[PDB]
Amino acid sequence: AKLHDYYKDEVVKKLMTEFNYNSVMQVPRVEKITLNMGVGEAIADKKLLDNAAADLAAISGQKPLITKARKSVAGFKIRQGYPIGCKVTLRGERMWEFFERLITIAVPRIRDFRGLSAKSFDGRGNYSMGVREQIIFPEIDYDKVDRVRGLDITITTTAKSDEEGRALLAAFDFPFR
Amino acid sequence: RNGRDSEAKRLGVKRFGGESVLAGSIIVRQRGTKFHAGANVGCGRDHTLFAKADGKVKFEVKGPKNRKFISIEAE
């Protein structure tokens, strides 16, 4: 709720100032933050996907939803309805708390941190990034890791254009190399 | 390599428009719901449409998809 209050005064005010909106509700707001961990090496092992699920359970504060295969493809030796990833849809209060931990303490603990790419918008403002280690979150115990498992974050927001998402995210200072 | 066909199933419209029916009479023995059930018409398990009340057969075209209903006018 720290960055939610910071949103409600200074990001709403700041973006009403920058872009010449009329409505106070036309301003972009971040809808949700989805944390995917598409493990894929669970074609042979179930405890590996269980450990992946424990890691997203630690990084967010929620149980993950173990996702199944939509189509069967033979390129990767999977089958229809076989469990192959896990995700957490963070929204509401926990979106802002995770977003605070993310841009505050998790992003600086990235190895060789140069900055987050500004051209990682999908055309509709929705950011998506990938971390390569789960170690960069302070909850994951470094002595209890077995496999290095990155994950991909996706900030989904209500902006129409992607420069409008540059503005929204950049008003949280959200590093942007 | 050929030379086979099934026995002809005798589908189609058994009672036409304006034709007086008893209750229970089969109107259209058919295969999907080419014709849908309307007022006082039932649809059997093999999509056979049968007269559920007495009257006269009424073929109509209803609804947003231009479906072909079959009503029965009470008569």
């Binding site: 929620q62 303490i105 941190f113 140069r114 | -």
Partner: protein, 55 residues
């Protein structure tokens, strides 16, 4: 949220070497020691020493 299927997500206090005492909710279940925060991380000095190579 549902009942107890989720991990215990209790408010803790993180503190780094920058003097940034910051209380947050995290499901570690333990108070935290850090080094780098968003305040006083070598991001801009890092970009400067990155560009500053040639000659």
């Amino acid at each position: 949220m549902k009942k107890d299927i989720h991990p215990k997500y209790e408010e803790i206090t993180a503190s780094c070497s920058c003097g940034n005492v910051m209380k947050i909710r995290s499901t570690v279940g333990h108070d935290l020691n850090l080094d780098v925060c968003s305040k006083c991380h070598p991001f801009f000095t890092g970009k400067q020493r990155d560009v500053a190579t040639g000659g």
